[PDB]
Amino acid sequence: SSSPKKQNDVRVKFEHRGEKRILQFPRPVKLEDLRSKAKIAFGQSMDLHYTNNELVIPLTTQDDLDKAVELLDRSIHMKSLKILLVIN
Amino acid sequence: SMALGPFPAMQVLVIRIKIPNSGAVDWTVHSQLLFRDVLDVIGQVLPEATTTAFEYEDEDGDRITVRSDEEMKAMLSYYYSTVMEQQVNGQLIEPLQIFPRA
Question: φ, ψ for residue A37 (rounded to 5)?
Fold first, then answer.
């Protein structure tokens, strides 16, 4: 076999000032990938926060994000990783 | 010998362009669909507005804005996965509904 061994992409739903955007990210996903795509999407460098229902938590390290992707992958009820974007 | 053939994305794509207080236009898309091409069709059917983007509703019921081809691909992929679930259960397939956005 000399074809690619694709894993599942990570579906991300970004939110900034009432606007939501969905992008697929190839694994393994990195914080800087999310930051750079969020910059393309909204024109500014963003702080990134994970959100699930009422919970919000900043994502500041690669490990933080890895934890959030794990939650998404085990969650049969969630189909995207929700990231709230705040300027800075 | 036997091998798997291609699994198609989905069976024709209908994009329902919902127009504010005016109705909807069902565009049957011939089989890559580009973001540019969707904006061009919106500009034909909604000619006295200028449209830079559009929205769709995701599985959470949220309005998602599309501003790029990569975003288009994520929208389409989700749509196709919903259509495939319903096709297998004989549920009515609905078109992919979009909302033009200033």
Answer: -70, -35
